[PDB]
């Protein structure tokens, strides 16, 4: 089954444009990823893995995130913050597993990895499993807006990952395996 293309790729997607990777039509063998990829984060809020043999998945979804260090705690049910409210929101009844791992050796650069973006401003809150690609400028004042300049601001901002950052600022490749058990 394809897990090699899902976990061992050169490039992933930004959190604002997170890839809802489709996994289907194969046999679940991710125990090698236990040893090949030492997942430091592994939180399962749904059923126990030991029950996974009773019910399998066909139309299961997977998510690929590239986010900061002091943010994996924000990817949890009932949590709040910038990313949870504007970028990716999980439902309260979330049955899935969050997995994260450090990616200094392949997602950091001396000049700066200016290829991963994240939403900052939006005139609303998000709902579970919603994706936004809009690039229209954000309004902050009463006057109508055409272009940047005054209070109006662009809605997207990029990261500045470097290999010599601290533990809380180094990029974490975060597979939020929000694999939906109810839908498959």
């Amino acid at each position: 089954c394809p897990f090699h293309e899902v976990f061992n790729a050169t490039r992933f997607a930004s959190v604002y444009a997170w890839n809802r990777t489709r996994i289907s039509n194969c046999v679940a063998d991710y125990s090698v990823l236990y040893n090949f990829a030492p997942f430091f984060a592994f939180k399962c809020y749904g059923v126990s893995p030991t029950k996974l043999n009773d019910l399998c998945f066909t139309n299961v979804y997977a998510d690929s995130f590239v986010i900061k260090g002091n943010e994996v705690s924000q990817i949890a049910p009932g949590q709040t913050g910038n990313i949870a409210d504007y970028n990716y929101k999980l439902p309260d009844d979330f049955t899935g597993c969050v997995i994260a791992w450090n990616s200094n050796k392949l997602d950091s650069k001396h000049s700066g990895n200016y290829d991963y973006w994240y939403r900052l401003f939006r005139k609303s809150k998000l709902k579970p499993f919603e994706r936004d690609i809009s690039t229209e400028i954000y309004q902050a004042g009463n006057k109508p807006c055409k272009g940047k300049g005054p209070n109006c601001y662009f809605p997207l901002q990029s990261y500045g990952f470097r290999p010599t950052y601290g533990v809380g600022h180094q990029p974490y490749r975060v597979v939020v395996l929000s694999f939906e058990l109810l839908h498959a």
């Binding site: 900052l120 401003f121 902050a140 901002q157 533990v167 600022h169």
Partner: protein
């Protein structure tokens, strides 16, 4: 649709832009500091120019939001930091003139040298050179020659520049809705808003006067003892009741009195504590010193160093291959990057400097969670005080005996304690009047009570009345004596040191009381005392988000500056001085002058 929401969004954008820009600038600066190479200078210049341009561009857009329509007391501080017109209130030509005058003053101070008479081919700089003469000479004529020379060559090339500097700075200060530039600096201690913790800009002067009115007896006794002891080295140059000449204080300006220990030691037969031989005999390195400092810091419950600090921070001099600047400094590059830059040697002085720098790093690491604009100390005095409390606490004989660097059978006597107390006093107590007088003179000059033609007539007049030092030769209005200092020729404040010195002993007393210590304060170690660390943490993580009065009250228990702990720390020395000088005279008269 309101103003508060728009201000919140504006600060949100600025917070994310400034982090990246500042990190780039700091990394470039560190890379320059490691080497000495042209391309590093080019990169540093480019990064600094970009950061300054971004800050200037962002400053203009922040004035659109009125300060009176926002009631949050947290975003208001950040906006007040940002809404400040720096030097753009005046016209472009005036700003160019101010930048030129500052650069000229700095260049004149930096590259000043004096040549011995009739020997044009032999000229000495300030460092090395005149400093060695000031710190390690027992002669009389040479010290006076150097003291008069340095000022004669430097100050007259700075006074006319300083007049225009003062005029333009006053113009800018009045354009910024202030009273003068002295009020501009006093505004750092200003607190407005929440009731019960207000601190007007004018309260600082009264507080400093009241606090200094209590230190006078101890300083009087110390001055009398020093004057009595120095009559043995300069038998025919010191008045029995007069003031001490300023050229015999072991320093160019008299800021510290440390270099007089070899002349005023009470018991010269009994040696002091020096563990250098113990350091050598056990094959100690810089890594061992740093790990011992880390062990000391963790003994009180504080966190320890990040892994990256052990990799990106250099500890020893690379050698002739590279060329670095050996100067201890704690670097906070942001985004979780903390480094230490110091060339370490096996010596007790480095053993204490490591503790000072690691305290710096701990304080910097404490407030990493606050927003970018609030990532600093409560005021300009907390930082070095937090650094120095550890250095004072780590030099106790009990700690040295506990770590095995001293012989367990060394019977500590009540005679070495006097020596240690005197050595500490000569460098702590003897600098407060100098700082206080310099700041008072600067404030009086900026305010306007002293006309342009009556500057020096006050400058030497205050000395005789406060510090007890007299000029060896007369001076006229052409000289500019204060500008000879680094902090006066270059635009720098000077009231930091007085507040830091008063805060450090108060914090030490609070921690020692919280540590269940029995005995004199000078024999206090905060090691193995969790209660002595957690309390300090309550101040470490606040940062600038709260008024400094509340931060001070959270540890000591009082919301105002106090001096009683400082005098309590020196009680046995005070008693010994009182007993010793019963046959001498305390006090000085402002009539005796060496030149008349």
């Amino acid at each position: 649709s309101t103003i508060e929401e728009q201000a919140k969004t504006f600060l949100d954008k600025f917070n994310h832009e400034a982090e990246d820009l500042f990190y780039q600038s700091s990394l470039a600066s560190w890379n320059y500091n490691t080497n000495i190479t042209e391309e590093n200078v080019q990169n540093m210049n480019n990064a600094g120019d970009k950061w300054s341009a971004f800050l200037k561009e962002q400053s203009t857009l922040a004035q659109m939001y009125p300060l009176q329509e926002i009631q949050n007391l947290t975003v208001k501080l950040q906006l007040q930091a940002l809404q400040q017109n720096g030097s753009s209130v005046l016209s472009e030509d005036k700003s160019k003139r101010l930048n030129t005058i500052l650069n000229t003053m700095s260049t004149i101070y930096s590259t000043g040298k004096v040549c011995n008479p009739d020997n044009p081919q032999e000229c000495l700089l300030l460092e090395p050179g005149l400093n060695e003469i000031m710190a390690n000479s027992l002669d009389y004529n040479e010290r006076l020659w150097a003291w008069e020379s340095w000022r004669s060559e430097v100050g007259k090339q700075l006074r006319p520049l300083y007049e225009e500097y003062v005029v333009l700075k006053n113009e800018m200060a009045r354009a910024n809705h202030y009273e003068d530039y002295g009020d501009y600096w006093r505004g750092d201690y200003e607190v407005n808003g929440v009731d019960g913790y207000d601190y007007s800009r004018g309260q600082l002067i009264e507080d400093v006067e009241h606090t200094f009115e209590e230190i006078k007896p101890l300083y009087e006794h110390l001055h009398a003892y020093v004057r009595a002891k120095l009559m043995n080295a300069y038998p025919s140059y010191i008045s029995p009741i007069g003031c001490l000449p300023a050229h015999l204080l072991g320093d160019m300006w008299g800021r510290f009195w440390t270099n007089l220990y070899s002349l005023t030691v009470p018991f010269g037969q009994k040696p002091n504590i020096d563990v250098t031989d113990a350091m050598v005999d056990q094959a100690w390195d810089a890594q061992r010193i740093f790990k011992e400092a880390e062990k000391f810091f963790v003994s009180v419950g504080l966190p320890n160093m990040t892994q990256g600090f052990w990799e990106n921070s250099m500890l020893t001099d690379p050698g002739n291959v590279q060329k670095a600047v050996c100067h201890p400094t704690a670097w906070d590059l942001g985004k979780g990057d903390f480094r230490i830059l110091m060339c370490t040697k096996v010596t007790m002085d480095d053993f204490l400097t490591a503790h000072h720098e690691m305290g710096h790093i701990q304080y910097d690491m404490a407030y990493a969670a606050q927003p970018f604009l609030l990532r600093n100390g409560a005021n300009e005095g907390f930082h070095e005080a937090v650094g120095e409390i550890m250095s004072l606490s780590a030099a106790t004989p009990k700690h040295l005996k506990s770590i095995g660097l001293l012989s367990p059978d060394f019977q500590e006597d009540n005679e070495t304690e006097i020596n240690f107390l005197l050595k500490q006093a000569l460098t702590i107590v003897g600098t407060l009047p100098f700082t206080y007088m310099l700041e008072k003179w600067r404030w009086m000059v900026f305010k306007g009570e002293i006309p342009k033609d009556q500057w020096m007539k006050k400058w030497w007049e205050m000395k005789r009345e406060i510090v007890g030092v007299v000029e060896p030769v007369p001076h006229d209005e052409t000289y500019c004596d204060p500008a000879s200092l680094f902090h006066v020729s270059n635009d720098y404040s000077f009231i930091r040191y007085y507040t830091r010195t008063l805060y450090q002993f108060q914090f030490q007393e609070a921690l020692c009381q919280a540590a269940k210590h029995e005995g004199p304060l000078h024999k206090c170690d905060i090691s193995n005392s969790t209660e002595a660390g957690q309390k300090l943490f309550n101040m470490l993580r606040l940062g600038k988000s709260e008024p400094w009065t509340l931060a001070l009250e959270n540890v000591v228990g009082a919301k105002n500056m106090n001096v009683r702990p400082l005098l309590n720390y020196f009680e046995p020395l005070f008693t010994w001085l009182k007993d010793q000088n019963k046959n001498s005279f305390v006090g000085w008269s402002t009539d005796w002058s060496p030149y008349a």
